[PDB]
Design a protein around this ligand. Structure first.
Ligand SMILES: [Mg+2]
Ligand SMILES: [Mg+2]
Ligand SMILES: [Mg+2]
Ligand SMILES: [Mg+2]
Ligand SMILES: [Mg+2]
Ligand SMILES: [Zn+2]
Lengths: 220, 129, 102, 221, 83, 24, 83, 71, 135
RNA sequence: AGGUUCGAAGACGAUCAGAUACCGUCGUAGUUCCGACCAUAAACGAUGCCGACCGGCGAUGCGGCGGCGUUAUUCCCAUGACCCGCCGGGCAGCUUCCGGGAAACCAAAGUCUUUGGGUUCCGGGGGGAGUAUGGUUGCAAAGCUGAAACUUAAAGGAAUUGACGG
């Protein structure tokens, strides 16, 4: 019952784009949440971090809106954090789920040392920054788990990271900033250039020009 | 006044790399700078560099390949032994898979991996990754 | 919070600027801080220009002007409405208000 | 274009000089400095027409690289250029936007006015900063017709010709249309294009309100 | 990627900007990837095959996108040497 | 109080204290 | 511009830059052959001379020191030394 | 900024031991006047004789008589 | 005072004008007699208010191109835009007044020595720029 | 020494519920000069110094350099005054997704978890308190150095919404 209004959404719906990494390669913005769940169906675990009651003073007292922080992601290298402020808690939860769905980023996993099997830790130490909260993710050997505060712990866990040291500075009591800083740190795992990425890139066709003939027929 | 010519050169390279320039000019050249840049060039983090010879201290123009994150300096040249080289390594490097620490040894100027290969310590110079 | 980058005055590379007295209340104001208005007004009212010209012994007599430089402290300036409070963005422009020649 | 067939002709030089398109502003942008020949005693900068030709040919290649001719969109918020972009769209199959550009056209996907093209072509960066800014949210490459003082923040294929003169704007748009149609299998590169560049010129209402009646008197007499 | 066994344990390889050699992130929507259509030698007509350039948001926000694209076209041969 | 007037009050009190101690 | 050629700047900007900020330092001054009218001998004079230069065969002045460049007296000829 | 020379350790340690007096815990623990003022004298517990039984009013928001003994 | 029309009447007027421009006229009573069949108006007062605004807008339309769309106005505009190319181009001047600097540029471009160029005398004085500040 | 004006203290007239005030009239010390003390200011850019690097633009001050022309005398160049540029050192300004910051904002308050150019001073929740005491300087006023007992769960900063404003 989904009617996409986007070239990307139409191509995703009619089985033209096979993986989310095809979109991630060309950095196309995901402007409708029904795109990703078609790919990561039945594997997108979800969690509500906090419900904070922001208030705005008015003439007749102060009125309360509820803000929902929602973290989603399969435990294989995709994670997303959404924040939605709505009058009702359930509506805020749905909106935050949709925004977390839109803001799904891939996660690069590396090795602490002696690269043996599936990568388990962050490729290097990365730093996310939001407000005054600074979060640093440090690679850790196999089996250490995620040593961190609980709020970044759950986000790192559902990002697919198995082992990681974490260091935080700032007002980590601010849960929104503390989650958003870790989300930034996780998201810039591919923003970091490493010598194994030094190979000169070969360019493939963007999905738009690769299926521009099918879009004319279907998505008029 | 300028007391660390290598520090000035490394900061200039770092700022030009962050700004995305293709070439950087570092004004006071020295043997230490040339050896440090030779280590970086052999590890591929920078391109060729050419030394302009005035009868004063020369200048250097370095071609930047764009694959450099940070090339800072450790200003007090601490005496680094092989026992504490590991602590220096995991304090200064982004990871164990890449990144290099250049330290001047009695055998010359070289990275920490070659220093441990030929079993010698020395004075810390800087790092690049 | 710093309201103005220039601290509400034109002193930039000085240590001390000599004060002047507000023409309205005789308050010592720094010369670069005071609001200055150079008024160049006809020595007679435009209601009385015709009567003066008719009563003049001369034929082509040009009426003299009155040149007065007025200095105001910001209190007297705001009270006298020569300057007004402005928004945070509108404080940043320095162009004087238009003369309104038509 | 480095080829011999892709070279400026004397007729093209004559059109460029007649329409101006080499007399820039009195200001110079430091990123536009590389396209300037010399500054006159008037303070008017002279723009290297060879460099303008090369940039225009590069823009033509970028435009013809798109399989779907509607995927390229041409925008002119200013009046001097709306007729040019409309005739360009009619000639090349592009998608025209003239006059007021409603914000959120490239980003707000709810309204019917929403569209997502594959290339942006802009008459002037200062006048069309809003589509220029909105192209930065949707991964949209940009050609813009820049003058000596035009900011190049989100501009990729800046063509250094003019943005002020109506004759210049009409001529540059007509020239770009001619080049893209010749690159495609539409024109034969041998005979001149039948479309007069006056078709792309913006006319002032005090000419629209007198030229056809003057012509009517001449025709009836 | 490319563990000691050999397989590429990495779910994609991001593109690198052709000017600053910076990694183009998944959520960097200011980045562009354009195609310049090179023509045949004799008729100057498009022959179907083109060449692709990628510019990152940092470069084409600081405004050096025009110079970068011009340099790339010059170096690869689209723009004549006597530009 | 205004800080300047608290300073003045403290100075008056300190002169009184010095006078009292000097009286011994 | 990100790809300025630092190794080969053109002589225009090379000359317009300050003497010390050039690639290699270059003095802006020179030496000149000065010809006093009514005299046969040729005098070698610094362009930025700080002293009143006199002919040895005649009690006449050849230049007057100024702020930057010595001003030659009128009627005196001068040419450059080895460019 | 702070000094970073190789033979600045004397100034570094002097500045540390000078600045360590400015936090309440260190000043309390090492000045000794707090130990003199403490009735227990650094003991966890103490013994005493009940001099009296008193009631202490609670603070401003609360309202109760806390039962204490003067010892 | 207090005779300002609202969105309901204005939008209805514009819609019916752009749908029935031929049938409508400048007579209020005829325009209020066409509305009962060209539209369904729940109220007589609303109907005649709409009709009055239609008369006003059609007077404005016959005196000029109001933003209300009109087929005759658009075909006239289309004729006046995609036609009237002059029988002689505006860019084929017999001579072009050309600056010596531009002549040097053309010489370097190799398009120097063209018979249609007349080199202007360069201006002298370099007196551009506006005087700085007021006064 | 000098003391015209202004004007702490003081006097009076008003105002006020009171009015030791704001307003008005007068007026001492002072304010001026010379010599000697004091060493404090929101002594402020509430922002250490030296050095390097990192955007754009238009001005301005000084010095130097280079150019169409106009102007001053003279017969011409110099030299002044304008005009268009370049360089260096300044006082600043506008703009910028350089970057930073809690933000206001800052091309420095940037080049900081990708943390190390040299070096000096200095802060450690709010009060008690810049207090007590000791020392020291000073003619004095006071300056410098400078606690503790005790008390307290906040005190503060920047922004937002509202309410209120003689
Ligand atoms: Mg305030
Ligand atoms: Mg002061
Ligand atoms: Mg008096
Ligand atoms: Mg220092
Ligand atoms: Mg304290
Ligand atoms: Zn006043």
């Amino acid at each position: 019952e989904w009617m996409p209004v986007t070239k990307l959404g139409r191509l995703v719906k009619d089985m033209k784009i096979k993986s989310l990494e095809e979109i991630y390669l060309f950095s196309l913005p995901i402007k409708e949440s029904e795109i990703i769940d078609f790919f990561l169906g039945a594997s997108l675990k979800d969690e509500v971090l906090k419900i904070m009651p922001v208030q705005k003073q008015t003439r007749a007292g102060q009125r309360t809106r509820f803000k929902a922080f929602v973290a989603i992601g399969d435990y294989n290298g995709h994670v997303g954090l959404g924040v939605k402020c709505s009058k009702e808690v359930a509506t805020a939860i749905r909106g935050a789920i949709i925004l977390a769905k839109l803001s799904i980023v891939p996660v690069r996993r590396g090795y602490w040392g002696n690269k043996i099997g599936k990568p388990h830790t962050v490729p290097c130490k990365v730093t996310g920054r939001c407000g005054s909260v600074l979060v640093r993710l440090i690679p850790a050997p196999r089996g250490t788990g995620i040593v961190s505060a609980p709020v970044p712990k759950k986000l790192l866990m559902m990002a697919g990271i198995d082992d990681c040291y974490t260091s935080a500075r700032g007002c980590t009591a601010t849960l929104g900033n503390f989650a958003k800083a870790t989300f930034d740190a996780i998201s810039k795992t591919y923003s970091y250039l490493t010598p194994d990425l030094w190979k000169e890139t070969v360019f493939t066709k963007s999905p738009y020009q690769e299926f521009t003939d099918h879009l004319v027929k279907t998505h008029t | 006044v300028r007391m660390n010519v290598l520090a000035d050169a490394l900061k200039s390279i770092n700022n030009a790399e962050k700004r995305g320039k293709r070439q950087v000019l570092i004004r006071p050249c020295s043997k230490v700078i040339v050896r440090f840049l030779t280590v970086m060039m052999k590890h591929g983090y920078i391109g060729e560099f050419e030394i302009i010879d005035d009868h004063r201290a020369g200048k250097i123009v370095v071609n930047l390949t764009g694959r450099l994150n940070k090339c800072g300096v450790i200003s007090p040249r601490f005496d680094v032994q092989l026992k504490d080289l590991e602590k220096w390594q995991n304090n200064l490097l982004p990871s164990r898979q890449f990144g290099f620490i250049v330290l001047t040894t009695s055998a010359g100027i070289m990275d920490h991996e070659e220093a441990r290969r030929k079993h010698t310590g020395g004075k810390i110079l800087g790092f690049f990754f | 919070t710093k309201k103005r980058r220039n601290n509400g005055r034109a002193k930039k590379g000085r240590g001390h600027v000599q004060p002047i007295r507000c023409t309205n209340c005789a308050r010592c104001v720094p010369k670069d801080k005071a609001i200055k208005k150079f008024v160049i007004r006809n020595i007679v009212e435009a209601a009385a220009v015709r009567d003066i010209s008719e009563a003049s012994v001369f034929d082509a007599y040009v009426l003299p002007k009155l040149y007065v430089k007025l200095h105001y402290c910001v209190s007297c300036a705001i009270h006298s409405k020569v300057v007004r409070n402005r928004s945070r963005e509108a404080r940043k422009d320095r162009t004087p208000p238009p003369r309104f020649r038509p | 274009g480095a080829l011999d067939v892709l070279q400026m002709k004397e007729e093209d030089v004559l059109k460029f000089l007649a329409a101006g398109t080499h007399l820039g502003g009195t200001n110079l942008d430091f990123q536009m400095e590389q396209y300037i020949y010399k500054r006159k005693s008037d303070g008017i900068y002279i723009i290297n027409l060879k460099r303008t030709w090369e940039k225009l040919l590069l823009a033509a290649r970028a435009i013809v690289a798109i399989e779907n001719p509607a995927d390229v969109s041409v925008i002119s918020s200013r009046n001097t250029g709306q007729r040019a972009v409309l005739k360009f769209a009619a000639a090349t199959g592009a998608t025209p936007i003239a006059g007021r550009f409603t914000p959120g056209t490239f980003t707000n996907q709810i309204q019917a006015a929403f569209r997502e093209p594959r290339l942006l072509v802009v008459t002037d960066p200062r006048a069309d900063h809003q589509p220029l800014t909105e192209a930065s949210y949707v991964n949209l490459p940009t050609i813009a017709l820049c003058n000596t003082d035009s900011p190049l923040r989100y501009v990729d294929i800046a063509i250094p010709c003019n943005n002020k003169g109506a004759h210049s704007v009409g001529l540059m748009w007509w020239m770009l249309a001619r080049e893209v149609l010749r690159m495609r299998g539409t024109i034969s590169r041998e005979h001149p294009w039948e479309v007069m560049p006056d078709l792309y010129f913006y006319r002032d209402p005090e000419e629209i309100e007198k030229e056809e009646q003057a012509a009517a008197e001449k025709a009836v007499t | 990627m490319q563990n000691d066994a050999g397989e590429f344990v990495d779910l994609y390889v991001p593109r690198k900007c052709s000017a600053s050699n910076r990694i183009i992130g998944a959520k960097d929507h200011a980045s562009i990837q354009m195609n310049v259509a090179e023509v045949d030698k004799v008729t100057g007509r498009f022959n179907g095959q083109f060449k692709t350039y990628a510019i990152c948001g940092a470069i084409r926000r600081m405004g050096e996108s025009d110079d970068s694209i011009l340099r790339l076209a010059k170096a690869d041969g689209i723009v004549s040497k006597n530009f | 109080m205004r800080a300047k007037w608290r300073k003045k009050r403290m100075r008056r009190l300190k002169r009184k204290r010095r006078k009292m101690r000097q009286r011994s | 511009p990100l790809a300025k050629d630092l190794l080969h700047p053109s002589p225009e900007e090379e000359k317009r830059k300050h003497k010390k900020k050039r690639l290699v330092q270059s003095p802006n001054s020179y030496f000149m052959d000065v010809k006093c009218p009514g005299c046969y001998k040729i005098t070698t004079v610094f362009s930025h001379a700080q002293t009143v230069v006199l002919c040895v065969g005649c009690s006449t002045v050849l230049c007057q020191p100024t702020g930057g460049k010595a001003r030659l007296t009128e009627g005196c000829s001068f040419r450059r030394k080895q460019h | 900024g702070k000094c970073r020379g190789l033979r600045t350790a004397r100034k570094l340690r002097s500045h540390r031991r000078d600045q360590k007096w400015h936090d309440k815990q260190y000043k309390k623990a090492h000045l000794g006047t707090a130990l003199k003022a403490n009735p227990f004298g650094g003991a966890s517990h103490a013994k005493g004789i009940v001099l009296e039984k008193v009631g202490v009013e609670a603070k401003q928001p609360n309202s109760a008589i806390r039962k204490c003994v003067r010892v | 005072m207090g005779r300002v029309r609202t969105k309901t009447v204005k939008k209805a007027a514009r819609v019916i004008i752009e749908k029935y421009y031929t049938r409508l006229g400048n007579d209020f009573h005829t325009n209020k007699r066409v509305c009962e069949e060209i539209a369904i108006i729940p109220s007589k007062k609303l109907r005649n208010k709409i009709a009055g605004y239609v008369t006003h807008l059609m007077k404005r339309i016959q005196r000029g191109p109001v933003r209300g769309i009109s087929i005759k106005l658009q075909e006239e505009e289309r004729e006046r835009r995609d036609n009237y190319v002059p029988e002689v181009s505006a860019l084929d001047q017999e001579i072009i007044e050309v600056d010596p600097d531009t002549k040097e540029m053309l010489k370097l471009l190799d398009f120097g020595s063209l018979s249609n160029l007349q080199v202007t005398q360069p201006t002298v004085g370099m007196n551009f720029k506006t005087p700085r500040g007021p006064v």
